[PDB]
């Protein structure tokens, strides 16, 4: 898609909705879910707390706090995954993923907790899968259980080939060896959508890569923070691209999603793969022009020059631009990245409507934007095969939307907001003064 | 997708297949189908003939010649639609569409109508009898007629009807109707002028299906709108409707036909990316003596209104699964390696058809869930892979059977180890070096390609 202008975003205030803050003092609220008790359960990434807010009153109780969660003030790590069991009534289990120190600097662990209604807390912990990659960047961590009862988990590319991890060789394309996988060497589990049994083991019907079946379901992802199933069993996803091509992808078994060789469509438009991990002298500066304009010494590969297999394109990109696009926009003062042709999707929620269904939102995908302070409504067709028209921005505000769910009746939306950060105001300029820090707000 | 280079096309020779010309010098062979009698049936667009060929022996027989078929030697009109009834044994019906004089016209060009008609096949007499007009009075012209006709899993006739070439070449100043929809009043008087650049869905008796999508309040024969020249149309085993379509100077498409979907033509070619194309409305040109620069709307003569794809106020837009090809605004549409024929070097392939490879007891390795797209101007058969559910494409369109021929249509034998293709009798094609020729290796031919 084509970038919306600062003007277009500013006029997307969603006047037709009543805004109402439920919670205010929250420490990096990450994910929120509609609990099996008709209560909203959210998480705090830094602290590892699992709250339970009464959606009708706003009363909150700290159910449990995941112990030893590591969190870098400058990072995206901490308590990440968070899901319930499909049949909670009969199987009261909660699934999470978090950043924990690795005695042999950190690892990522997918852990199952056992819910005790009597004491109303989490007990009997079992590690489903550990030794997973960890860094301060692009951890992703969306954890959902599918219609097949499998754990679907997104694990980012750890931020390799950019910023702090500029010269680390991106492994979104890398797959494990039978020998490594046999030694629980999950170093390849970067930029992947994992699919695992409820005991952390490898599903026997998982896709094969290099003659090897592992926990990998799909590959070639950057920072896929959005992951949600549709009423008909399809897997929609939202992902963060580089200076461009944030995506809405349809996850399919064994599908290769191109990162880092391809950002968005394979069109050689506005992005080229500049591999800094192969640069001669590692002193070379990343010009931050999305690979379109690079410093001498860095091997650049056109997406069209990629010799990949099973490449699956996005259903939509926010946004795709041409090579003439200016990645240094003066409108964003110093924070030049906020003026990049992206929206920074923090999640992906599939709106199931209800007896109070918002009119015209049938088969829509809600995608919250961090940097743009909007929540996108992406309409798809009844079969969830394609998108109709564009991504319509909603609830414009000086806030960084982190997640979003809807009530059963489906007339009220609950969104989480970043405790702090940079967001684009009504003009093209930027600010770090967030209107609603670490909050759970409700739109009716 | 990004355009292949002449050299990449050139090496797509396909040595892994045996090339064997069955027939030659057919009169503008258009569509071929695999008959129930395990014999190959093909159509001759100009003459209106229906030929039955013996796959192994090559014996031809003119089974039937559709009477009054109108065809301009220079146009894309004539006998178009050609389909058998799914259960041909119980229901021996052949469905066609063709250009016929319209006694009820009021124009120069626009003197013809397109008619979807049913024929009954007589076993012992071996010819088509008892003709039944199902839907007549359909738009007609020399350009973009499309005319693919398939019978859907729902027992409905699905038909592609091009935008009639409006807004280009000989119809440059005619207002494109791809996005237009019929009023009830028009539907009552059987006025189907708006049936342009559409995928029609109609009952077998030719009436409007009660469960057809609505467009601006009216349920008509329209299933999907906003098409240019959709020559490819084929159902996948799981009921999905795949389609191939010709774009302007760029953005040929592989589309997934979705009920009520707006495929955007002419305001959008390929993705809504505002890249390489722009909608220049020549019918609204200030001074109409102006010329069409043929630079895909990026650069147009003075006086012609131009609307960006992003400025398009349309709804239900469905983007293509793949574009052949998409390029940026800096693209040079005046490519000197094609010289006098500046159109063949454009980032397009002129997809001539769309065939779903169903495999079989001798299926080709790795061809599961593929879509064979014959290219006219590139002399290749693109093999496009999709996932098992036919939801997405895998990788790019791979060129096959490179040759100085205009591939028109393609099918596979039931066992799946041989491909049968039709080539144009005359026309332009890109040579291995990127330049143009009209010297076709196998003019109006029926070629069989057998696998390893
Ligand atoms: O393209 C951008 O301008 C931009 C902005 C932001 C942002 O504002 O937080 C992120 C990203 N990109 C991004 O790629 C990304 O993976 C990301 C993660 C986060 C986050 O807060 O967890 N922000 C962002
Ligand atoms: O862009 C092109 O270079 C190009 C080439 C050709 C061709 O080679 O026939 C056609 C077209 N475009 C085209 O747009 C088109 O609708 C078309 C129809 C036909 C045909 O033979 O029926 N060719 C072509
Ligand atoms: Ca980004
Ligand atoms: Ca991708
Ligand atoms: Ca791209
Ligand atoms: Ca064309
Ligand atoms: Ca289209
Ligand atoms: Ca376009």
From Swiss-Prot, chain A:
Where, by residue number, is the active site?
Answer: 138
Residues that hold Ca(2+) 2 according to the record: 247, 257
Q: Where does Ca(2+) 3 bind?
A: 263, 265, 267, 303
The taxonomy runs:
Bacteria, Pseudomonadati, Pseudomonadota, Gammaproteobacteria, Moraxellales
InterPro entries of this UniProt entry? 6-blade_b-propeller_TolB-like, Glc/Sorbosone_DH, Quinoprot_gluc/sorb_DH_b-prop, SndH-like
| Oligomeric and partner information | Homodimer.
Q: Which residues bind pyrroloquinoline quinone?
A: 337, 342, 371
Residues annotated for D-glucose binding in this entry: 76, 137, 162, 222
- Report the EC code(s) recorded for this entry: 1.1.5.2
One of the Pfam families matching this protein, by short name: GSDH
Its domain of life reads: Bacteria
Region annotation PQQ: where it falls in the sequence: 222-223, 400-402
Q: What does this protein do?
A: Oxidizes glucose to gluconolactone.
Q: Which cofactor does it need?
A: pyrroloquinoline quinone; Ca(2+)
Residues at which Ca(2+) 1 binds: 241-242
Catalysed reaction equations from the record: a ubiquinone + D-glucose = D-glucono-1,5-lactone + a ubiquinol
The name on file for this protein is Quinoprotein glucose dehydrogenase B
Other comments? Answer: Acinetobacter calcoaceticus contains two different PQQ dependent enzymes with GDH activity. GDH-A prefers 2-deoxyglucose as substrate, the specific substrates for GDH-B are disaccharides.
NCBIfam families per the record?
non_repeat_PQQ (TIGR03606)
Its family remark reads:
Belongs to the PQQ oxidoreductase GdhB family.
A single Gene Ontology MF term assigned here is: quinoprotein glucose dehydrogenase activity
* Applied biotechnology: Potent biocatalyst for the accurate in vivo monitoring of blood glucose in the management of diabetes.
Record note on cofactor: Binds 1 PQQ group per subunit. Binds 3 Ca(2+) ions per subunit.
* Keywords in alphabetical order: Calcium, Metal-binding, Oxidoreductase, PQQ, Signal
Q: What is the organism field in this record?
A: Acinetobacter calcoaceticus
UniProtKB/Swiss-Prot annotation, chain B:
Q: What is this protein called?
A: Quinoprotein glucose dehydrogenase B
- Binding-site list for Ca(2+) 1: 247-248
The similarity annotation says: Belongs to the PQQ oxidoreductase GdhB family.
Q: Which residues bind Ca(2+) 2?
A: 253, 263
Q: Where does pyrroloquinoline quinone bind?
A: 343, 348, 377
Q: Kindly give the NCBIfam families that the UniProt entry links to this protein.
A: non_repeat_PQQ (TIGR03606)
Tell me which EC number(s) this protein carries. Answer: 1.1.5.2
Identify which residues the record assigns to the active site.
144 (proton acceptor)
Q: How does it assemble?
A: Homodimer.
Spell out the reaction equation it catalyses. Answer: a ubiquinone + D-glucose = D-glucono-1,5-lactone + a ubiquinol
- Which residues of this UniProt protein bind Ca(2+) 3? 269, 271, 273, 309
Describe cofactor binding as the record notes it.
Binds 1 PQQ group per subunit.
Q: What class of enzyme is it?
A: oxidoreductase
Keyword Calcium in annotation: yes
Cofactors (names)? pyrroloquinoline quinone; Ca(2+)
Keyword Calcium listed:
yes
* GO MF terms, alphabetically ordered: metal ion binding; quinoprotein glucose dehydrogenase activity
What does it do?
Oxidizes glucose to gluconolactone.
Which Gene3D superfamilies does its entry note? TolB, C-terminal domain
Name the gene. Answer: gdhB
Report further notes. Answer: Acinetobacter calcoaceticus contains two different PQQ dependent enzymes with GDH activity. GDH-A prefers 2-deoxyglucose as substrate, the specific substrates for GDH-B are disaccharides.
Q: Mind listing the UniProt keywords for this protein, alphabetically?
A: Calcium, Metal-binding, Oxidoreductase, PQQ, Signal
Residues that, per the record, bind D-glucose: 76, 143, 168, 228
Applications: Potent biocatalyst for the accurate in vivo monitoring of blood glucose in the management of diabetes.
Q: Which domain of life is it from?
A: Bacteria
